């Protein structure tokens, strides 16, 4: 079982779903179309926003192409948004990809930060490792049972 958690704005919770596309399911975190397991999301405005605004949370904005499901990209560079090549730093038609959220308690529902964690299982014919509270019993052979 794999549990990976991240903080997103409450507006984009619906984009964490199989088949959804947008500004967060195409450049940041994409899910497969045959996804098993499922998500959990709860509001966390109590401890994620300041009166002056929380600027510690980032999200990618520009990428060359959409990323395959279950992929990560922490690289930093300067986007080529024009004919003139961008050597580095900031310039016209040369954008920095990462941008900062601006969570504040004044904002209404839909702009306050949300705290989401997604679980992922798998059901394949492999030696099982984790499951719930069941008590094993004795084995019966050559008799009609309910195994």
């Amino acid at each position: 079982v794999y549990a990976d958690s991240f903080v997103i704005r409450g507006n984009e919770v619906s984009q964490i779903a199989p088949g959804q596309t947008g500004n967060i399911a195409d450049y940041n975190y994409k899910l497969p179309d045959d996804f098993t397991g499922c998500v959990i999301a709860w509001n966390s405005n109590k401890l994620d926003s300041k009166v002056g605004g929380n600027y510690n949370y980032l999200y990618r904005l520009f990428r060359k192409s959409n990323l395959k499901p279950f992929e990560r990209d922490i690289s930093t560079e300067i986007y080529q948004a024009g004919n003139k090549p961008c050597n580095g730093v900031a310039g016209f038609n040369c954008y920095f990809p990462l941008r900062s959220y601006g969570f504040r308690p004044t904002y209404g529902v839909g702009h306050q930060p949300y705290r989401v964690v997604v679980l992922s299982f798998e059901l394949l014919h492999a030696p099982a490792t984790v499951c719930g509270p069941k008590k094993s019993t004795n084995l019966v052979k050559n008799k009609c049972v309910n195994f």
Binding site: A17, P18, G19, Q20, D33
Partner: protein, 49 residues
């Protein structure tokens, strides 16, 4: 495909598949009986000749 996302397109395009499969099964079922009748007539014609 253009107007809906995959999670609902997968649900909607099943009804058309079932309907077309039924419409083709009916055609082959009728063709079998028609061929049987034609074969009986052909056997009668062969005997008559």
């Amino acid at each position: 495909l253009s107007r809906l996302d995959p999670p609902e397109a997968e649900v909607q395009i099943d009804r058309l598949i079932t309907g077309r499969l039924q419409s083709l099964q009916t055609y082959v079922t009728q063709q079998l009986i028609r061929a049987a009748e034609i074969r009986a007539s052909a056997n009668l014609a062969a005997t008559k000749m």
